[model samples]
Target chain A: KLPVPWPTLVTTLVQCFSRYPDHMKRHDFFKSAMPEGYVQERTISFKDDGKYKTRAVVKFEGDTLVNRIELKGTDFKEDGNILGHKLEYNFNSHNVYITADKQKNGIKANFTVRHNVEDGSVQLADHYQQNTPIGDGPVLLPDNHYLSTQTVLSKDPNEKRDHMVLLEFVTAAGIGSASQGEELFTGVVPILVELDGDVNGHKFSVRGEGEGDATIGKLTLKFIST
Target chain B: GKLPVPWPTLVTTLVQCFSRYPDHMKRHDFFKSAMPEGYVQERTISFKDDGKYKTRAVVKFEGDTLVNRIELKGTDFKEDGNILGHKLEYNFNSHNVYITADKQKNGIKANFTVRHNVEDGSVQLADHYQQNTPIGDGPVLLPDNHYLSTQTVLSKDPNEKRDHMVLLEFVTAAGITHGSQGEELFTGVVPILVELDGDVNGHKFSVRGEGEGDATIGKLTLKFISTT
Candidate 1:
């Protein structure tokens, strides 16, 4: 191997900071000191406790997950007792999310969703799943104004693992987060707008939108490893 | 109801239906039909089963050849018909329909997948697709292939939020067709179903939608309106 002075004043000065203990530590404890192009992988799971526990896997380049989610057709408070969410890590930590919009009185509904990578964080190029977003309900809306579930876009392969998950409930209404929105699904049948998504490879959020709605507040994000 | 047409015919019919969706209902992201198909459009269609029952079929089109997806929801209809009518959805890419059906009888309760055998000549109703069964009767396409008259009646009732209705009727129909895979599949049955507004009716049945209706229905009637 040809060995020589690697760089100039700026590069030399930067490297000297870590190399010379007088100015800094002999070893750069603040940096990942490993062989060049060293690759590591870890897989985790976010269990889905639906009629079928068809959970998700997160593969971490250590990326993140997240989404626009909610309960379908049923009142948020009425079916609150059974509300569940999961923060998963699969497909190398890609976000793949879903929700059960089940009604305690009538029937159970499901939001078939896809995980989206944010800010080029770590979107698996697999695109096995593509741009599936809540804004896309193209929304499985509620009576007055809620949301409709959008189709799952595919991309990348989880490569054995994916990303973690997150859930949030920003508003009770599932649509019009943008201006010019019409329906506000609550007055009569208040379906809780639950946010289900993926993020940061290991964090998962399961929250919802609405007033001091007694139901979804009781929802707990349970993690099951498989 | 059954809505079947030569795929090309269905394309024109869909263009008609979505062209009439309300401005508010025109919102959708399936406009991604833009990437590969280079087509995009969103529209709404409503079936006002009188005042108490109703549903909206919001559709997104990618070019005139494919339907990206359709979202169906409404008042009494959507709430009661959870299998595919209520606030359900159908994504056409995989031809997988995850609808908020119009009733609770089909019992699979929860979002499920039922692929409409696109290869099948008939795209039947959710009743058959959800049950994984098939029949030769119900609804079809052809006559139902009419322009979607965006002009519809609004709910005059002050207690109602309905501002637009009347996209169904001749818009689409339920259809069922066999498959080459020995398995069955289908599509094109708009989630909107029809029923008697009041009183008890005889046994529930399917009607041939005269010349105006396709496999969608077989019933006929007359109405009068005046401009003077």
Candidate 2:
């Protein structure tokens, strides 16, 4: 028998973009990914690195990911680490950080990806870039000081129509100053579709509501690569 | 005493603006309502109604039964009773105008008042809100998947030190985004809680909160006082 030919980077990524969730749904993955009694948020971000740079973020109950493929100038990298029951992947240009733990049912992945709006690209060189110093020298900002401005939940059961969801994280560009001062860091927001539904060919209605959370918390993260 | 003058249109318009609170609160954008000419004079009424029904505002009114046209921004309002059946209370100072209304009908009465201060300051509210599925779409909002939206309100002194009165009002609503299915309008006020003092690294700071006048949600009058 002859060997089978794998799909190309563009082909696989587009497929993942449209059908990844369906794959998860079929395996009842979200049942674990999005447990009851918690706010399930999924975000899709694109790094406009003068190229077609895109990434999807799934976060519910703390499991996140940077799945499928990571792009390089011409080649793509795949993190085929099938940990217990969970699957992992990687991308290029910027940092697509994801950490997960094996569970009884499936796997719970906690992933976080950083992208640049100017190029829509990820930092493919390193994985521990969460606090990695960059620029002329090595100026770093406080951890988690920047929040994703363009993140939206993908599993919003209440969503009925199709709309674009944008996501981003802001950080200071440099260190403190004398005459004046400003914070600095890396990562810009990239937005995409969070939910798209229709009844037959007709679109559903758009509604809005409020949720509260004045409390704040902190967490520690550990990164790994294969 | 001369017969109390009747201002039907002004009173009704005020009622309409107050009633459109919850709906405006759920919207995914800022709620800017155009006040009728001669109804809300050179004044700005701003409030934040976090979907949890906890709504508040900063108000500065000028003049008596004098209503002037202007833009009003805020959320959540309910009408307690007929304007005619309510008593008016007014107290004036160099930069403050205090007005209160007390009404009683068939033993069930409601009292609401607002005080306006001409001080140059601002009010800020840190609010959080969540939405559930059963809560249907609002008349003017889109039905997105996520059921929660968080927002912050910053109302500062518009720079000018003209007649100013900061007023507080309240009403009954679980949050800014809870109500029946369709668009039902009611009139009332939304009061807030805040603190304004000190500075932040070479800059000034101010905040707001629910005041002593939570029970009454009424309109305000901005009066310039002269301590001579």
DockQ of each: 0.03, 0.02
**TM-score per candidate, chains pooled:** 0.18, 0.20
lDDT of 2 by residue, B158-195 (tens): 33243222221112111234332122211222222222
Model 2: per-residue Cα lDDT over A1-226, one tens digit each = 0010101111111011111111122322222232121122222222221112222232222222212232222122221111111111111111122222122222222233432111222321111211111112211112211121111111122434332111111111111111010100011111111312121122222212221110111111111111
lDDT of 1 by residue, B104-197 (tens): 2211111222222222223323221221111122221112111121111111122323221111221211122221111011122222222111
List the lowest-lDDT window of 10 residues for candidate 2 chain B.
Answer: B101-110
lDDT of 1 by residue, A56-79 (tens): 221112111111232111111211
By DockQ thresholds, what CAPRI class is model 2? incorrect
Maximum-TM-score candidate? 2
Candidate 1 chain B minimal-lDDT segment of 10 residues: B178-187
| Clash totals in order | 110, 87
TM-score for candidate 2, please give it. 0.20
In angstroms, the error of model 2 at A209 is 21
lDDT of 1: 0.19
Candidate 1, DockQ to 2 decimals? 0.03
